[PDB]
C-alpha cells in the first residue's frame, strides 16, 4: 500500500446539461463525464506527505482544458495571429463558468491535504485519498481571483518563495468581497465596478498585517502595475461574453489602509471599465476582434476571493516592500484552487 509521485492524463467530470446553450455546459457535455455519484474519500492514517502547488501537473492540464474551452466557445469576428487574417461568424454566447472536477484513471489517485492552514508548499499532516477533486470554476481573470474558494480560518499567503521577486504571490482571503460590474442600458463600451470601500479597505488592512508577518514587520506599500500589456495592467475578465478591462488604482489606495484611519475612504469604490473588442490571444501571440456589446444592462456580481501580487525587490537600502497587482500567468488561478491536490500512482 505505497505510492509514488507521478503525472498522468486526467479526465473531467461535471453536472453539464446537454440541452443547455451555455458554452461551458456545451464543452463539458462532450469533454467530461457526469460527476461521481458516489465519491469515496478515505483518510490516510497518520501519513505525512509533501505537496508543492507551484510544481503540479494538474495545473497545466487544467490550463490546456481552459484553452480548448475558450477556443471552442468564444468566436471572434476576426483573428489576426501571424500572417493570418481569418474572418468568421461571431455570435454572442451564453457564458457562465460551471465547476469542473478533475479525476485520475485506474492505477492513480489524488492525495488531498486537509490541513486548515495549508499554504500550498511543504509537509501535510491530514492526508486523504480521493478519485476526483471538488468542482472548480475555470474563472479567467487578472489581478483578482473571483468566484473561488476561501481560506478556512486565516488569510493565507502562497508563494514558491516569498524572497524570490520572480515568484508570484497568491493571497487567499477568508472573507469574500463583492465586486459588482455594470454596463448600464443606454458610450456602449463604458462600464464600472462597484466595491464596498469600508469592507474592502478593512480586508486590505488585514492583508497588509499578514504580509507584515512574513516580511519582518516591514512597511507594506501597494502600487499600480509598472507596465505590461493591458490584459495584466488592468483587471480583465469575461462577463456574459464581454471582455471587461477595469482600472484598479482605487483598490490599492494606501492612504485608506493606514492605522490613523479617517479620510473619505469608506464610501463606494467605483472602478472605471471598458468593454474591449480587440483582445490579445492567450494561446499564441495574436489579436482577436469581437463584435460590440449587446444592448441592455450587462451586469456581473462576483466574489473577490484572492489577490495575485508581485513584489518589487531590488530593495536593499530601504525599509519597505512594494507590491503590485498581477501575476506570472493564468495557471496561478488554477493553482489557487488545486493547491490541496496532487496526483500519485499506486503500485
Amino acid at each position: 500500500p505505497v505510492w509514488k509521485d507521478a503525472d498522468t492524463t486526467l479526465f473531467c467530470a461535471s453536472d453539464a446539461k446537454a440541452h443547455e446553450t451555455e458554452v461551458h455546459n456545451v464543452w463539458a457535455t462532450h469533454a467530461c463525464v457526469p460527476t461521481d455519484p458516489n465519491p469515496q474519500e478515505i483518510h490516510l492514517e497518520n501519513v505525512t506527505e509533501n505537496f508543492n502547488m507551484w510544481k503540479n501537473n494538474m495545473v497545466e492540464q487544467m490550463q490546456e482544458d481552459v484553452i480548448s474551452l475558450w477556443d471552442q466557445s468564444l468566436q471572434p469576428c476576426v483573428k489576426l495571429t501571424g500572417g493570418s487574417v481569418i474572418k468568421q461568424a461571431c455570435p454572442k454566447i451564453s457564458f457562465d463558468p460551471i465547476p469542473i472536477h478533475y479525476c485520475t484513471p485506474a492505477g492513480y489517485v489524488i492525495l488531498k491535504c486537509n490541513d486548515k492552514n495549508f499554504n500550498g508548499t511543504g509537509p501535510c499532516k491530514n492526508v486523504s485519498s480521493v478519485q476526483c477533486t471538488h468542482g472548480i470554476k475555470p474563472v479567467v481573470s487578472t489581478q483578482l481571483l473571483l468566484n473561488g474558494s476561501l481560506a478556512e480560518e486565516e488569510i493565507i499567503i502562497r508563494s514558491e518563495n516569498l524572497t524570490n521577486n520572480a515568484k508570484t504571490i497568491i493571497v487567499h482571503l477568508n472573507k469574500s468581497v463583492e465586486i459588482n460590474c455594470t454596463r448600464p442600458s443606454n458610450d456602449i463600451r463604458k462600464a464600472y465596478c462597484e466595491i464596498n470601500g469600508t469592507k474592502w479597505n478593512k480586508v486590505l488592512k488585514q492583508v497588509t498585517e499578514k504580509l507584515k508577518e512574513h516580511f519582518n514587520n516591514k512597511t507594506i506599500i501597494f502600487q499600480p502595475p509598472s507596465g505590461g500589456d493591458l490584459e495584466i495592467t488592468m483587471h480583465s475578465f469575461n462577463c456574459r461574453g464581454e471582455f471587461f478591462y477595469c482600472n484598479t488604482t482605487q483598490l490599492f489606495n494606501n492612504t485608506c489602509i493606514g492605522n490613523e484611519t479617517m479620510k473619505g475612504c469608506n464610501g463606494t469604490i467605483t472602478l472605471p471599465c471598458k468593454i474591449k473588442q480587440i483582445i490579445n490571444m492567450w494561446q499564441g501571440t495574436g489579436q482577436a476582434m469581437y463584435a460590440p456589446p449587446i444592448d441592455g444592462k450587462i451586469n456581473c456580481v462576483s466574489n473577490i476571493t484572492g489577490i495575485l501580487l508581485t513584489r518589487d525587490g531590488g530593495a536593499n537600502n530601504t525599509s519597505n516592500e512594494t507590491f503590485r497587482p498581477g501575476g506570472g500567468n493564468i495557471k496561478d488561478n488554477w493553482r489557487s484552487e488545486l493547491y490541496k491536490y496532487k496526483v500519485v500512482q499506486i503500485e
Partner: antibody
Amino acid sequence: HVQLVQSGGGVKKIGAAVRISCEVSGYNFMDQFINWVRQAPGQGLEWMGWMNPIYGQVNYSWRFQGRVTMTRQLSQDPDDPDWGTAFMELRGLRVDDTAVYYCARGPSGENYPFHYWGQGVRVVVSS
Amino acid sequence: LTQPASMSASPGQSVTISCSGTRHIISAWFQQYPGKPPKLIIFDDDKRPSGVPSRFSASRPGDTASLTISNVQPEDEATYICNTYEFFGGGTKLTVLS
C-alpha cells in the same frame, strides 16, 4: 545552444534615451524571463529589472522606476516561434548612467541564478 | 552582500573570498575577467557547472558564503562576485602575484 546577442549601444547625449536589444535563440522565448543588469566601469553588478515575455509584465528596481521600460518583440511566423527579442530603454540619461549593460536569464523553469548572459553593450553619456 | 574590494595570492596557494549578508539565501558565484561578461562558476551553494575547474569550491552554512580556490593559477586573476537572486556583491578582485 542558448544564445543572447545584444545590440544598440554607444555614445549618447546628456538627457536623451537609449534602447538596447537582446535577441535570443536556442529556446522558447516565452518560457524564460529576461533580466537586465548594468555595470559601471570598475563597479559591481546592478540588477535593473526583469520582464516576463508572456504578457510583458515587468519588475523594476526603485533606482530605475519611472526611467526604464522593458518590452518584447515576439515571433510571428509559425515555422519559427521559439525566436524572440527583448528590449530595454533608459530615458533621461546622465553621465552616471555610463555602464556596460547585459541581458541575462536563468536556468530552465526559473529566473535565478543567471546562468546565461549576453555579451554586453557599452553606453557612454557625455556632452 | 559585502565582500572585500580585492584580494591577493601566489601561484599554488589556496585563497578564500567571503561574502556576508546573503540572508540565508542559496546564492551563486560568478567569475568575471576585465572587459568580459560574468560567467557562473557556482550555483546551489556548492555545485559547479561543466567546464569549471575542480579547484573551485564554495559553501554557505549560514549568513556567510565562501568561495575557496585551491592550487591558485594565474588564470584565476579575475573578479569574483557573490549573488543572491537579484543582489550582487561588490566583487572581489583576486590578483595572482606575478
